[PDB]
Design a protein around this ligand. Structure first.
Ligand code: ADP
Ligand code: MN
Ligand code: MN
Lengths: 234, 234
């Protein structure tokens, strides 16, 4: 519903609309337009943008493409300072308005279509469990004379010997010893929950959260499955 | 040995270094051992060469039997420090299995394979450089002699493998003491072979044991850095 969107704009006194999409590598991208640029046209014909700018997309001759807002994805950004509404978009070929061969979201939609077409089933269910790390300092580089990477976190077992300004309080998860020691060994309870609350404010449904195995901040937020394309969005 | 240590210590000092004969200064790399090659002789002939195993005399075998019978007590002199036992740990090349062989370097007693019968001898591998020359060598002898006087047969040579796999019959064959206290206690109980000939007196033995128990206590009573890693967050 494009009308639901126009009411969310007034209800939250939205000043901007953040148009989002994903590139081939999987990285979410965005561009912003003032809320006042959202009209009837916007939904039926989308907005134009340069294709040649994204890696692995259009080359030298056929740069221009279409950003098609998917009104079902509207959700408020919980971090931006000024009220802004996020709207995920698909990348369509201009004129034909088909769905770019290289647009990963279009590809995923095509795959859900083909599922229904073969008649094998009518919906696919995906429940991915992404894990991640939370650090304090990450440094790296590479040049002709060398290269390096340095990781640092207050939980890192290696910091058992580190001198700290206000003293080393030393309750850290040892190597492979992160699976569930209660705080203070686990330093990320408050943060894992904020992530949960915020994820839900954004439409996700959280099932659980916990510290993972590795020292130095491995963590996990488990979310409820959903239909394939909606889950990738999630 | 005393001169040897003196030269090592002082040449090192003169070169701007510092030398140590401690048996295991570092966890994770080789310790320092002091293998002892031994053989007996009379009127210029080597009493250890013969037709038995690997070119040995039956006298050599009784000697070996003696060393094996009194190993734990010899340990109190040949491995007189708590540190000594950080070298003698279930490792692959750890000279801890009380057995002989000309190949199996799991065996604390190697039989050098040499051509000239004039050079036939045994190599007791578990001693470390912290050992008192005098007392260590003496205890090795007395154990050997008691092995002879009482025709203590060695049993058969171990040519299989060390402490790990084996692990078949739980591989509980003879082994050297696993701690200084254990070795001191063995020396306490198994002192007869040393008192033979009035070589070692009870007073001497008891005094030695008392000196080392005081050392053993410092280590047993002082918290170890690793204990913090293991139990601070208990
Ligand atoms: N068809 C399905 N029915 C029920 N749950 C499903 C289905 N398909 C996927 N799931 C997903 O199983 C995942 C959750 O549980 P989790 O405790 O993280 O398991 P694990 O111990 O394997 O990491 C969620 O992503 C859940 O929604
Ligand atoms: Mn997990
Ligand atoms: Mn040797």
């Amino acid at each position: 519903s494009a009308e639901h969107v126009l009411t969310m704009l007034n209800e939250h006194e939205v000043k901007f609309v953040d148009l989002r999409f994903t590139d081939t590598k999987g990285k979410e991208q965005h561009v912003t337009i003032p809320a006042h640029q959202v009209n009837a046209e916007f939904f039926e014909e989308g907005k134009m943008f340069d294709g040649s700018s994204i890696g692995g997309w259009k080359g030298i001759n056929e740069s221009d493409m279409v950003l098609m807002p998917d009104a079902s994805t509207a959700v408020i950004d919980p971090f931006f300072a000024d009220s802004t509404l996020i709207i995920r978009c698909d990348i369509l070929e201009p004129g034909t308005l088909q769905g770019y061969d290289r647009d990963p979201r279009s590809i995923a939609k095509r795959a859900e279509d083909y599922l229904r077409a073969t008649g094998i089933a009518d919906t696919v269910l995906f429940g991915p469990e992404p894990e991640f790390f939370l650090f304090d300092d990450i440094r790296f580089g590479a040049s002709i004379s060398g290269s390096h990477v340095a990781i640092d976190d207050i939980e890192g077992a290696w910091n058992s010997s580190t001198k700290y300004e206000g003293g080393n309080k030393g309750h850290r998860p040892g190597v492979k010893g992160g699976y569930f020691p209660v705080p203070p060994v686990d330093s990320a309870q408050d943060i894992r929950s904020e992530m949960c609350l915020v994820m839900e404010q954004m439409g996700l449904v959280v099932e659980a959260h916990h510290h993972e195995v590795a020292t130095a901040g491995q963590n996990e937020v488990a979310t409820r499955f959903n239909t394939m394309t909606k889950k990738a969005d999630e | 040995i005393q001169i040897y240590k003196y030269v090592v210590h002082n040449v090192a000092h003169r070169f701007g270094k510092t030398a140590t004969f401690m048996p295991k200064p570092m966890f994770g790399d080789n310790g320092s051992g002091m293998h002892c090659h031994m053989s007996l002789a009379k009127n210029g002939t080597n009493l250890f060469s013969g037709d038995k195993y690997a070119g040995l005399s039956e006298q050599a075998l009784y000697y070996i039997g003696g060393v094996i019978k009194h190993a734990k007590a010899i340990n109190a002199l040949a491995n007189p420090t708590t540190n000594s036992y950080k070298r003698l740990v279930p490792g692959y090349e750890a000279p801890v299995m009380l057995a002989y062989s000309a190949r199996n370097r799991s065996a604390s007693i190697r039989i050098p394979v040499v051509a000239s019968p004039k050079a036939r001898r045994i190599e007791v591998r578990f001693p470390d450089p912290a050992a008192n020359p005098y007392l260590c060598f003496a205890a090795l002898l007395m154990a050997g002699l008691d092995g002879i006087k009482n025709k203590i047969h060695p049993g058969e040579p171990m040519d299989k493998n060390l402490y790990d796999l084996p692990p078949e019959e739980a591989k509980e064959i003879p082994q050297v003491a696993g701690s200084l206290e254990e070795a001191l206690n063995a020396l306490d109980l198994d002192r007869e072979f040393l008192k033979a000939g009035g070589v070692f007196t009870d007073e001497a033995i008891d005094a030695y044991i008392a000196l080392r128990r005081e050392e053993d206590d410092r280590v047993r009573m002082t918290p170890h850095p690793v204990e913090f890693e293991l139990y601070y967050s208990v």
